[model samples]
Target: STGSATTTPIDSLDDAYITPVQIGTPAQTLNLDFDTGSSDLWVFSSETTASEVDGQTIYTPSKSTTAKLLSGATWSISYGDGSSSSGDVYTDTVSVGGLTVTGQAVESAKKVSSSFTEDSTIDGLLGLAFSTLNTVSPTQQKTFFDNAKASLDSPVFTADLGYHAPGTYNFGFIDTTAYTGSITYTAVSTKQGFWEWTSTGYAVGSGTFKSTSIDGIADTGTTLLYLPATVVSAYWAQVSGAKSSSSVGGYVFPCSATLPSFTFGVGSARIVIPGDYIDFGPISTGSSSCFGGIQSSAGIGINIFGDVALKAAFVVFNGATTPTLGFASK
Candidate 1:
């Protein structure tokens, strides 16, 4: 079976891409963050104290008879940012797009961090990464895609994130019209429990491509792109108004400054991100300084190709066998 759904970005920043997911027999729908960076299908639920709940839609297992508690099962995840969430597990019929996975592990959040509470957009997260990263203890649970892979015509899913509009996510088969020309296939390593792959090189605007192997993960859940300091510096150097502001935390430039387009290689495929995309939007509501979509990954270890990079192309996470990634210009 094939499944298709739309993932939309609410704010101008494209901070979190939200998708509608149906859970339980009666179908309680919730807007979830499609995070490929983590492996946990958790949401604010009845178990969570109302005091901790701000404006998020809570999932109640009591409403659906199909929802069964996984008794001793528990899961907890602490992100790099220090925010975390944990709760017991439930086996319920969960549906994403049109594909349904029965007896899927649904982590009900009894605990949530202030960060999650403050992020009024998404009620929870639906992890698209490998199931190996699932935080469920005693028995790690498989992701929605992992459990639905066998039922899909093709064991794969594609992410088409939009800049400000809604993008499409398809499962089972690739939508030929969604991308241009042919897809450049590249091997992916699940050793990191991520869709990790290496780019051939990168180029700054019209500058000649700098041939180097840059290892990074294409994370749909992440907001911005993070590249190596060298690459980020070289790109920002093209803009005279750009500065690596210590107080600002990252490279920022006047909103009027013309941002140079950033190009990254996927295998031999060169995916170009428009300059307008890099100008991320004003740092503040009325500020003239804007944050660069591509930032330095100095403190963090690995480079990340977030929505800033992903939205520029049509990405396919092929889990047919060992798992490979396909990229094409949109």
Candidate 2:
């Protein structure tokens, strides 16, 4: 039953957090991330150095007796930005929440730049975006999901993202406590790897809404929600008493005083986006820029409905037949 779900915070090495899940016989714990773009479960090794990063968790291999490196298996992953990281492969006893499985495949990166190696929280990322981009065999292969499926109740994985809270990305099975009703399903756009989506329209405050005339992607890999600059600007203009300022990361405004409720519609179902999402705190430079929840990433292709919006609802990336997507709730 769903009531058996385990949602506890694992051990903390210094400030880093880990979750215990099914990896093999003896369950192993791993870190989580909202990666909707790529599909790979990678961890770090004790050989990693703090100087290599700014705000990332580093995994220590020596602590686990079951951890084994695949010697010749090395990986070099590069983000959209010019930054990259290279690491060796290691098999470890893996776990998430309370599920345990043996011979789980994991990666151990050694040389990485600040973009990846800096975090002090997670030592690795357990990618659970989709089934297409999975790292197949003959390519230094083996994935955490493929190996652990034998131990899972249904050979299926769920991501219970807690964007509602201010903490690390919470993953694993869907949390029944988070939702109250049945799930609402929308057929996913039958695209290849990307999570293409079509919404009925966007909601902006009272009496301001658009229709499903746009194409977007429901991406967990992306950190922020990407929208057309012109579209977002027009929406913000409707915000009464909306004064804009310079927030460190982006355009942040102190509109929380009267945050307008907004919603994004997917067919007949409504995906509500809370006001707090738009009320970004002051930036690093102490500037007063209003954080615009939806920013312009036009040149970046499709707009991404990231974890910020996804965490609020029960989403299902259905790859069952010909790459279709679907959604549901408690």
Strongest candidate by lDDT: 1
**Candidate 1 TM-score, C-alpha based:** 0.98
Report how far residue 174 has shifted in candidate 1, in Å.
0.4
RMSD of each: 1.0, 4.9
Q: Quote the lDDT for 271 in model 1.
A: 97
**Candidate 2 lDDT, 1-330, residue by residue in tens:** 111232222222111123333332333344455356655666555566546755544556666677786666766666544555666766777655445445656666677677565554554556554545545333645445545455444444454445433332223344446565655555566354566777677776765577755677776655556676666666567665454444343445553455565677867777776666555544444644445565665667677776556655666554344444455433
The local lDDT score (0 to 100) that residue 323 gets in candidate 2 is: 43
Q: Model 1, 216-274: lDDT tens per residue? A: 89898877889999999999999988989898889999988988899999887899999
How high a TM-score does candidate 2 get? 0.77
